[PDB]
Write an enzyme that holds these catalytic residues in place. Structure first.
Site, PDB file in Angstrom:
ATOM      1  N   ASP A 196       0.643  -1.278   0.083  1.00 18.31           N
ATOM      2  CA  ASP A 196      -0.211   0.144  -0.077  1.00 18.31           C
ATOM      3  C   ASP A 196       0.909   1.277  -0.054  1.00 18.31           C
ATOM      4  OD1 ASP A 196      -2.082   1.921   0.294  1.00 18.31           O
ATOM      5  OD2 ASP A 196      -2.185   1.703   2.357  1.00 18.31           O
ATOM      6  N   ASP A 201      -1.714   5.467  -5.223  1.00 19.39           N
ATOM      7  CA  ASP A 201      -2.094   4.717  -3.882  1.00 19.39           C
ATOM      8  C   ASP A 201      -2.595   3.305  -4.482  1.00 19.39           C
ATOM      9  OD1 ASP A 201      -3.529   3.554  -1.781  1.00 19.39           O
ATOM     10  OD2 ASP A 201      -4.545   5.541  -1.368  1.00 19.39           O
TER      11      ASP A 201
HETATM   12  C1  LIG Z   1     -12.763  -0.807   0.659  1.00 18.92           C
HETATM   13  C2  LIG Z   1     -11.716  -1.759   0.696  1.00 18.92           C
HETATM   14  O1  LIG Z   1     -11.073  -1.940  -0.825  1.00 18.92           O
HETATM   15  C3  LIG Z   1     -10.162  -2.952  -0.973  1.00 18.92           C
HETATM   16  C4  LIG Z   1      -8.711  -2.719  -0.504  1.00 18.92           C
HETATM   17  O2  LIG Z   1      -8.616  -3.201   0.904  1.00 18.92           O
HETATM   18  C5  LIG Z   1      -8.127  -2.120   1.952  1.00 18.92           C
HETATM   19  C6  LIG Z   1      -7.155  -1.134   1.694  1.00 18.92           C
HETATM   20  C7  LIG Z   1      -6.722  -0.044   2.484  1.00 18.92           C
HETATM   21  C8  LIG Z   1      -5.789   0.860   2.121  1.00 18.92           C
HETATM   22  C9  LIG Z   1      -6.441   2.019   1.884  1.00 18.92           C
HETATM   23  C10 LIG Z   1      -7.544   2.150   1.037  1.00 18.92           C
HETATM   24  S1  LIG Z   1      -8.428   3.644   1.097  1.00 18.92           S
HETATM   25  O3  LIG Z   1      -9.170   3.979   0.016  1.00 18.92           O
HETATM   26  O4  LIG Z   1      -8.864   4.024   2.613  1.00 18.92           O
HETATM   27  C11 LIG Z   1      -7.240   5.032   0.614  1.00 18.92           C
HETATM   28  C12 LIG Z   1      -5.861   4.723   1.531  1.00 18.92           C
HETATM   29  N1  LIG Z   1      -4.854   5.853   1.456  1.00 18.92           N
HETATM   30  C13 LIG Z   1      -5.051   7.327   1.542  1.00 18.92           C
HETATM   31  C14 LIG Z   1      -5.704   7.474   3.019  1.00 18.92           C
HETATM   32  C15 LIG Z   1      -6.993   7.975   3.492  1.00 18.92           C
HETATM   33  C16 LIG Z   1      -7.317   8.363   4.720  1.00 18.92           C
HETATM   34  C17 LIG Z   1      -6.279   8.031   5.516  1.00 18.92           C
HETATM   35  C18 LIG Z   1      -5.272   7.582   5.395  1.00 18.92           C
HETATM   36  C19 LIG Z   1      -4.137   7.202   6.589  1.00 18.92           C
HETATM   37  C20 LIG Z   1      -3.641   5.764   6.820  1.00 18.92           C
HETATM   38  C21 LIG Z   1      -2.727   8.152   6.224  1.00 18.92           C
HETATM   39  C22 LIG Z   1      -4.473   7.650   8.068  1.00 18.92           C
HETATM   40  C23 LIG Z   1      -4.846   7.289   4.173  1.00 18.92           C
HETATM   41  C24 LIG Z   1      -5.335   3.490   1.458  1.00 18.92           C
HETATM   42  O5  LIG Z   1      -4.284   3.455   2.594  1.00 18.92           O
HETATM   43  C25 LIG Z   1      -7.489  -0.126   3.777  1.00 18.92           C
HETATM   44  C26 LIG Z   1      -8.526  -1.292   4.029  1.00 18.92           C
HETATM   45  F1  LIG Z   1      -8.954  -1.406   5.316  1.00 18.92           F
HETATM   46  C27 LIG Z   1      -8.934  -2.248   3.153  1.00 18.92           C
HETATM   47  N2  LIG Z   1      -9.777  -3.239   3.343  1.00 18.92           N
HETATM   48  C28 LIG Z   1      -7.768  -3.718  -1.209  1.00 18.92           C
HETATM   49  F2  LIG Z   1      -7.954  -5.003  -1.111  1.00 18.92           F
HETATM   50  F3  LIG Z   1      -6.541  -3.455  -0.683  1.00 18.92           F
HETATM   51  F4  LIG Z   1      -7.814  -3.400  -2.608  1.00 18.92           F
END
Ligand SMILES: CCOC[C@@H](Oc1cc(C[C@@H]2CS(=O)(=O)C[C@H](NCc3cccc(C(C)(C)C)c3)[C@H]2O)cc(F)c1N)C(F)(F)F
Length: 375
Positions: A35, A218
């Site tokens: 990620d 991302d």
């Molecule tokens: C919804 C399932 O999709 C499948 C998806 O599963 C997940 C993936 C992630 C990683 C997230 C996915 S997101 O859509 O939430 C954007 C985020 N990156 C930007 C972001 C947004 C908000 C907060 C933060 C922090 C960590 C810096 C605080 C970072 C990423 O990291 C968390 C989860 F739980 C699940 N399951 C996958 F399976 F990986 F394709």
């Protein structure tokens, strides 16, 4: 060698790409979601209905509790755990073991995905966005500091798993030119989009709108996510181009499937999306072109397998543009942390059909000298 690292990723459509890692002594094997959109290394560390296995701290004689709790809220999904450090390796990555921070997940809500085959997450972005705060050194920072592996990694994600190459660029994984866009700020992998076209038609927005309030690369996010105003314009344009067929409102909300008889998907009626990224030189850009084969995501469910069914993999965002997995797929993406830039090239698994192909092309010149950064 990079040769040893090729094809070290696996995944299921819509469920991320993961790499095998070991944690602890003796090594405990886990699959870990790659990620680039976060900066915490975290693993399931207690029973959960969707976990096939989990990290058992009590069986690692090298584990150290940091006596600090941690909570990470993603856009969708959240977990809470206890921070510690332990020895970590990547069996099909660099031949090194390092001591890294690890969050042991003890409670979670919509974090783990049933059947995904991963049990943790490897946040590859920068310390600025780590929880609880930027003093928690991310895994990749630890790896570089302790091994002097070059400060660079690359991802080749392949659609219906791919390769994560740490420490360098593997030329066998791409063709054509590698084009670089600067990393605007070291927190997320933040980049700047300077122009968007749908089937060659400029969306004609002030370019700052494309980056409200940031744009990031991302890998943990499935979809291309767009700021409200851009999303609405994009959907209108994609609708106009595909108007020969009608789809349910639920389809355009990314919720409902559309299916066609096996092999008859009308790819031609869907437009190509061109995202132009800021170049290394003032007012120069390059574009990556996204085919419907990318932004219409195939579902792999056995129950739906008689036909070809897809979800619309573009979503509205309230937290900026997110260039997720469907965008990265078919490109070789170089996270050149040492030189603060991200490179894109057509990868060995690029999407194409007889009429169209994913591409990386440039340079393009823009007359307007406005800074497209939202800041
Ligand atoms: C919804 C399932 O999709 C499948 C998806 O599963 C997940 C993936 C992630 C990683 C997230 C996915 S997101 O859509 O939430 C954007 C985020 N990156 C930007 C972001 C947004 C908000 C907060 C933060 C922090 C960590 C810096 C605080 C970072 C990423 O990291 C968390 C989860 F739980 C699940 N399951 C996958 F399976 F990986 F394709």
């Amino acid at each position: 060698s990079f040769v040893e690292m090729v094809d070290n990723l696996r995944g299921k459509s819509g469920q991320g790409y993961y790499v095998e890692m070991t944690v602890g002594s003796p090594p405990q094997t886990l699959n870990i979601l790659v990620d680039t959109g976060s900066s915490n290394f975290a693993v399931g560390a207690a029973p959960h209905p969707f976990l096939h296995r989990y990290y058992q701290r009590q069986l690692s004689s090298t584990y150290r509790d940091l006596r600090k709790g941690v909570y990470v809220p993603y856009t969708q999904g959240k977990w809470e755990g206890e921070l510690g450090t332990d020895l970590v390796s990547i069996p099909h990555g660099p031949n090194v073991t390092v001591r890294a921070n690890i969050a042991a997940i003890t409670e979670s809500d919509k974090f783990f995905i049933n059947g995904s085959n991963w049990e943790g997450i490897l946040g590859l972005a920068y310390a600025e966005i780590a929880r609880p705060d930027d003093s928690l050194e991310p895994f990749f920072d630890s790896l570089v500091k302790q091994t002097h592996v070059p400060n660079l990694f690359s991802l080749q994600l392949c659609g219906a798993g791919g390769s994560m190459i740490i420490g360098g660029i593997d030329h066998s994984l791409y063709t054509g030119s590698l084009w670089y866009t600067p990393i605007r700020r070291e927190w997320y992998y933040e980049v700047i989009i300077v122009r968007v076209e749908i089937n060659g038609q400029d969306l004609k927005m002030d370019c700052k709108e494309y980056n409200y309030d940031k744009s990031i690369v991302d890998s943990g996010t499935t979809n291309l996510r767009l700021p409200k105003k851009v999303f609405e314009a994009a959907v209108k344009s994609i609708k106009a181009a595909s108007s020969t067929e009608k789809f349910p409102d639920g389809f355009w909300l990314g919720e409902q499937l559309v299916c066609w008889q096996a092999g008859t998907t009308p790819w031609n009626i869907f437009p190509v999306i061109s995202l132009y990224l800021m170049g290394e030189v003032t007012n120069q850009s390059f574009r990556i072109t996204i085919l419907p084969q990318q932004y219409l995501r195939p579902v792999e469910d056995v129950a739906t397998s008689q036909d070809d069914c897809y979800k619309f993999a573009i979503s509205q965002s309230s937290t900026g543009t997110v260039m997720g997995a469907v965008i990265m797929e078919g490109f070789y993406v170089v996270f050149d942390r040492a030189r603060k830039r991200i490179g894109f090239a057509v990868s060995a698994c690029h999407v194409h059909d007889e009429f169209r192909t994913a591409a990386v092309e440039g340079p393009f010149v823009t007359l307007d000298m406005e800074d497209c950064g939202y800041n």
